[PDB]
Design an enzyme around this catalytic site. Structure first.
Site, PDB file in Angstrom:
ATOM      1  N   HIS A  75      28.441  20.737  34.055  1.00 33.12           N
ATOM      2  CA  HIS A  75      27.514  20.772  32.933  1.00 33.12           C
ATOM      3  C   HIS A  75      28.217  21.148  31.635  1.00 33.12           C
ATOM      4  O   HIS A  75      27.816  20.687  30.561  1.00 33.12           O
ATOM      5  CB  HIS A  75      26.377  21.746  33.233  1.00 33.12           C
ATOM      6  N   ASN A 101      16.314  17.699  29.286  1.00 29.93           N
ATOM      7  CA  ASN A 101      15.654  18.953  28.944  1.00 29.93           C
ATOM      8  C   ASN A 101      16.182  20.042  29.868  1.00 29.93           C
ATOM      9  O   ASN A 101      15.845  20.080  31.054  1.00 29.93           O
ATOM     10  CB  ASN A 101      14.140  18.808  29.063  1.00 29.93           C
ATOM     11  N   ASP A 102      17.012  20.932  29.325  1.00 36.58           N
ATOM     12  CA  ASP A 102      17.642  21.968  30.132  1.00 36.58           C
ATOM     13  C   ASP A 102      16.679  23.075  30.535  1.00 36.58           C
ATOM     14  O   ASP A 102      17.036  23.897  31.382  1.00 36.58           O
ATOM     15  CB  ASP A 102      18.818  22.575  29.372  1.00 36.58           C
ATOM     16  N   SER A 103      15.487  23.125  29.948  1.00 34.48           N
ATOM     17  CA  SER A 103      14.509  24.156  30.254  1.00 34.48           C
ATOM     18  C   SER A 103      13.471  23.710  31.271  1.00 34.48           C
ATOM     19  O   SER A 103      12.633  24.520  31.672  1.00 34.48           O
ATOM     20  CB  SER A 103      13.809  24.607  28.970  1.00 34.48           C
TER      21      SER A 103
END
Lengths: 811, 811
Positions: B396, B482-484
């Site tokens: 990542h 979207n990392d959240s």
């Protein structure tokens, strides 16, 4: 160099000017809630963990220093000031600060208005209580405004200071009545919140930092205070704060009282919400009601005073020297208890970001606080032993909060296991409770592998026996007691670790210091082995101790002092052959303490060499000559400039061992002379040079090779206090716990006529009067107990809750 | 809301008041030496690594904001001030700041004295040059003193801010002539040092912070400046600084010039010392001589200007809208190049403590800067591919400094591998250089496992094919774009990672966004496979793409918009059935970009739903309705208060994809309307609401559910600049690189009469004039090249270094 004085009746230090050489701090709290507070009311609070539960924000190494704390602003017809003189820094008519036991007081006066604030953490209370008195000492009626201010932390200091990209959007507060609740991330996984309350109706509030202060303003002149009115701002991200404002009217001679509380609350996951989006405030209501009048606060204050008095009462000295009385009776024991409560987490030099303390640090602190809290000491010893590995080694870092070892830091510091034996022996000598040996203690925190505590001691003892070097001396590993002596590192990379990154096999470099420590603690190990009935094992351990003593005498002595180590090339360290570092201090104290060289004059010669080469007016330096360049084969010790830290700095912790060795050779004048050079009360007259708190020990004082020779660093959090107290109270004054009872054996200056010590020991009180009619330094001519002469120097054990008179005549 | 204006002739932004809503910053340096500088000259410098080679100290989230920088004090007969108005903050007669391309200028006047400073980093130079002009615009003779000040960092920001217990004893400097050398830890393991110099004889210096400033003083009033005299202090531990003082005498109308340099030097380990304890200064001497006159500085300044002009010249627009011209021609491309140079390391919201940037962020920035630096883009693509794992997944976090992946952060973000295909296709379309496909690229940075770059693309493509979910849609993993959105986390513990601590197997939760991305990049993958001659392997990939499109149409559409995901319970996310989060923005843009639902009205319906439920005057929000409580099954997205960050905030990055999707359906008015709502130059008139730099994009603007609706966070370091530039320059204006050449296909507002674009492409220049006589939005009626009508919409490739005129008539 005075900026204050000692008040012994109130057990306080009084600071009379706000501009001390450095901010001088104090600690509040005993169990869970803790506060660091400076003499200008700077600092911060946390709940059991400075890293993961920080309540208020503090900036280290800031310009100006120590900016941020519990700030009260008095606003009077346009003028405004602060009781602590900071952050406003307007001239006060009068200023005073008092650091007491668990509390701090700050008083300031301007334009006829006096403000007195008392800060303390009550017992069994998760908050900091601030009692504020405003008094009109002028001739005219006054109409003023009082502002309070704190700045919240987002619960995680590292995240709070690094991860702005997320946490500038997370700050949340609630305002209700006279209470401001900080509840960042309470909607999510967090089940705790903080609050700031005052026990009176408020005229305004502020919770957004940019509204109360202003973006381009500082703490010295917040815009809301400049205007004399609150903005009633509600925080929405950015920096949450808490500020009340109360408009007050004071007649001449009239005073008003307020109670501010900074509190911490934890709810159960099923009781988090009063309604949707509204936190449950029941516990906060109960906490605030607990201290909503001045009478309740005063009762709690007296209870805290009684608690600290009981803590300090088990060793009481009466001598002709008031500096010595003050050090022994109040401040040394206070520092020991504070170190037990706080570990090595947070100070004005420790940023509170670390994860634990040293294993040896905890074991050595026990030696200092064992006589004050024996049962907590027993529990701490068991917890420390539970983290030991099956081979006898220990993790370098202990985590008191989780009672675990640090797996990522490693366990190759070869002096660590012996400190466990030393602390266990000290606890048993203090209490006489041998039953701790029979407790079942897990290995590596694993109940499947548990064995007796005595088995843990055995494995610690044989860890040294199984890791001897080519000369029969212990292998040093990554490091020994001196964490900067890294003989297997050979680091060349600037960001690399010196302690836990090794490039050598570790099968050559030896430590003479660990050898002396092994011989010193082997006596206790053998004695404990005899108690358990294991006579053959005691004989074998004695054989190993004798072999180590012979090895020390054959390869550890240089001719006038003891060597320090052998490096990975098998070459001497701390020898007259070396160009720099001809003599070290660590190898002398423990070698003489083990009684090596007493009959042939080797111990005396080594101590004379210590005086000749290491002694300065501010104490003894670590080694001489200092290193003037990097030595890749020695590690971090040579990376400092000369005279600083472990490159020839002065450490009180290893000065105390030289003091004990000096008593061992029977030279009490030298021991006391060394003691006074580093004892806080005796150097209070040169505060400006010392620059740090004159009432607690510091870790390091710059050595004679430094330009700042005499300046201290890293105060308030260090193991120096414990063994300094042991050296003064047991080795000089001669009141020593022993397996069979209390042993009397003073080593004191010849000129002293005598003194008195009241000692609480094993359930009774001993009132011991020492007399020196013939003016000797060592030797007991007679001991009388309850009017009857006894045999030997061991007092009988009564355990009857009564006071027994002991008369010791020296000679 | 203005605090300045654009100066397009000089390619600058001019700030006319020092109290901006927030400090507005700029970046200096291109290759190795980098500086962040604010409009009051605050900030700091580093060498290639903000975390491990910080040169100067900066305090984030400080009170007052942005305190610490390159501070010049003018001292005039007791009065003193600063040209940047800070830190002194005394009222100036005139103040101005200019942020240009790679340089900043600050001018300030007081009591007839004008001081103007130019800061910039010259090309191929490891330092920051500050050219200072002092001028007497008064009527009388003046005798003044000039002070320069900077505060050093101890080379390691994290250690510098946490490890005081050691580093308060490590600071070291040398002073020689007019140069102060900072050399902390140069004696042990560091082979580098810093220096601060001025090109004139000095009257005094300071290097100890406590001597120059004073312990209880701030930057606003240093004691040495208050006294008008240097203290000539030599640093010894604590806080090293660098300060010069020059006594100057100015006649009316007379001016003086000075050159200050902050330089960084690296020595070889064998050429480290001139003598014992004296650093080798040869390279510092050469550096200082390089810029010891104003003429040399001006020559370097013009060279930097020419460099940036050449960088910005490959795409030049001429339209009727000066805001659009300014955004396309200067600031968007400038931000793209700066992001390439700086990665995600340091800003005023990123603390510079991280260890790398996102893999997908690195791939997406290339789409923005590929037309400016093609060869560096090729190298970056190869470096990114070399870190890919054998199964096709990627780390990542990418580390451009070491060109490695972060092993400790993990690799289960199931959208990352497709960005590599997207970036490679973009590079090939830009350059036409297919040879990159046949380069030998290691896997996991292992030359033993190396294969072709096309094989890396194949493994990225089949990573999705091998991880489909129950509905035939890609498994989301830890997160996606979207990392959240963490559908496998189920975190209940604070301090716990949402992104890399999973509690579920991850075999159920699916992402519709990854499905749309897969269908969108599959076209490029099939084209590349056809180029490589692998016709059988392209048919199978086409079959997989068709299957994914069918799965999207059968399980990804909710009735009026595309679904977002399925959670670990197999329940819809982003559906009208949900209570909150009925529609998301991410699943619409990529779905329409892939051309799903174009012929049956599904794409148009989804875009109408986006307009109806997500549109605000400040842009489009991420999802609607916002989440009002924590959802354990959704992860971090629910942890923010409504309207902030990923809980219904406005992200320009995913607004650009909706802009492109609007062009795809042929609605150019809507695309341009969305573009203006978020383009910096168009929101400069409301700078007080936006609060951040009006010349660069920010990551997030508070959504309609927030109380600070319209306020920005996390500016200047982002990925939004790249695809925003792509959307305006290729999808709206229609100058789109293609495999066979340059494709013309505008999608513009109907009211536009036309425009012109000069494009440097594949070795030639195209001067393309677009005309809209019939006022349509999409459709090209005719194209003429060099006066000859062509067939189709692909321009021929010349690669001849000449300019060719292109006439496009829409209709």
């Amino acid at each position: 160099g005075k900026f204050g004085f000692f008040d012994d009746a109130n057990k306080e230090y009084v600071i009379t000017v706000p501009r001390t050489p450095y901010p001088w701090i104090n600690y509040l709290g005993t169990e869970n809630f803790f506060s660091l507070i400076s003499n200008t009311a700077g600092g911060y609070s946390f709940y059991r963990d400075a890293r993961l539960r920080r309540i208020t924000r503090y900036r280290y190494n800031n310009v100006p220093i120590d900016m941020g704390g519990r700030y009260f602003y008095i606003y009077d017809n346009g003028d405004f000031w602060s009781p602590g003189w900071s952050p406003v820094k307007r001239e006060l008519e009068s200023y005073e600060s008092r650091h007491g036991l668990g509390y701090t007081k700050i008083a300031g006066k301007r334009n006829g208005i006096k403000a007195e604030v008392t800060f303390f953490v009550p017992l069994n209370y998760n908050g900091e209580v601030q009692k504020l008195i405003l008094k009109n000492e002028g001739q005219d009626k006054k109409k003023i405004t009082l502002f309070s201010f704190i700045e919240f932390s987002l619960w995680n200091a590292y995240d709070d200071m690094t991860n702005f990209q997320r946490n500038f959007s997370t700050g949340e507060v609630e305002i209700e009545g006279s209470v401001i609740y900080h509840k960042t991330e309470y909607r999510e996984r967090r089940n705790h919140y903080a609050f700031y309350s005052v026990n009176a109706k408020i005229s305004g509030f502020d919770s957004d930092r940019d509204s109360f202060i202003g973006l381009y303003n500082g703490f010295d002149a917040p815009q809301a205070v400049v205007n004399g009115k609150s903005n009633n701002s509600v925080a929405d991200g950015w920096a949450p704060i808490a500020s009340h404002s109360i408009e007050i009217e004071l007649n001449p001679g009239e005073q008003k009282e307020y109670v501010f509380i900074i509190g911490y609350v934890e709810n159960k996951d099923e009781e988090k919400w009063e309604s949707k989006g509204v936190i449950n405030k029941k516990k906060a209501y109960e906490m605030i009601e607990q201290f909503n009048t001045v009478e309740k606060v005063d009762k709690a204050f007296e209870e805290l005073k009684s608690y600290w008095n009981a803590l300090l009462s088990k060793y009481f000295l009466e001598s002709h020297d008031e500096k010595l009385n003050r050090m022994v009776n109040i401040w040394n024991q206070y520092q020991s208890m504070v170190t037990f409560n706080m570990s090595r987490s947070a100070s004005y030099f420790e940023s509170g970001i670390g994860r634990g303390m040293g294993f040896r640090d905890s074991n050595q602190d026990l030696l200092g606080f064992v006589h004050q809290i024996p049962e907590r000491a027993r529990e701490r010893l068991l917890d420390l032993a539970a983290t030991q590995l099956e081979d006898g080694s220990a993790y370098h870092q202990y985590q008191p909060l989780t009672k675990k070892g640090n797996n990522e830091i490693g366990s190759n510091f070869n002096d660590d296991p012996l400190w466990l034996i030393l602390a266990t022996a000290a606890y048993i000598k203090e209490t006489g409770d041998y039953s701790i040996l029979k407790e079942q203690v897990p290995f590596n925190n694993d109940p499947s592998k548990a064995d007796t505590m005595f088995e843990h001691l055995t494995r610690s003892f044989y860890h040294v026996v199984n890791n001897l070097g080519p000369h029969g001396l212990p292998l040093i590993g990554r490091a020994d007691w001196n964490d900067s002596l890294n003989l297997n590192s050979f680091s060349t990379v600037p960001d690399e670790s010196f302690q836990t990154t090794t490039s050598k096999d570790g099968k050559v470099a030896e430590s003479v210091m660990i050898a002396g420590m092994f011989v010193f603690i082997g006596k206790d190990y053998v004695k404990l082995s005899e108690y358990m009935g294991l006579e053959e094992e005691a004989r074998k351990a004695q054989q190993h101790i004798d072999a180590m003593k012979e090895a020390i005498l054959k390869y550890g002595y240089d001719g006038e002092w003891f060597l320090r180590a052998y490096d990975d090339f098998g070459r001497k360290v701390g020898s007259k052959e070396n160009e720099e570092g001809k003599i070290f201090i660590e190898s002398q104290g423990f070698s003489v303490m083990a009684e090596i060289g007493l009959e042939d004059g080797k111990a005396l010669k080594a101590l004379d060499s210590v005086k000749k080469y290491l002694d300065t007016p501010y104490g003894l330096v670590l080694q001489n000559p200092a290193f003037t360049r990097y030595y890749i084969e020695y590690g971090e010790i040579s990376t400092y400039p000369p005279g600083y830290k472990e490159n020839a700095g002065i450490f009180s912790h290893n000065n105390a061992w030289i003091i004990s060795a000096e008593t061992v050779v029977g030279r009490g004048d030298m021991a006391f002379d060394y003691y006074r050079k580093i004892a806080p009360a005796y150097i209070e007259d040169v505060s400006d040079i010392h620059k740090l708190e004159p009432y607690v020990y510091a870790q390091m004082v710059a050595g004679k090779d430094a330009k700042r020779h005499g300046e201290a660093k890293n105060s308030w959090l260090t193991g120096t206090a414990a063994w300094n107290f042991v050296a003064i109270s047991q080795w000089i004054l001669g009141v020593k716990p022993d397996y069979d009872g209390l042993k009397i054996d003073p080593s004191i200056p010849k000129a002293w006529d005598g003194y008195k010590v009241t000692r609480y020991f094993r359930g009774s009180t001993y009132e011991i009067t020492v007399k020196n009619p013939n003016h000797v330094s060592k030797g007991v001519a007679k001991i009388t107990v309850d009017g009857n002469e006894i045999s030997g120097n061991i007092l009988p054990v009564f355990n009857d809750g009564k006071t027994h008179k002991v008369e010791v005549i020296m000679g």
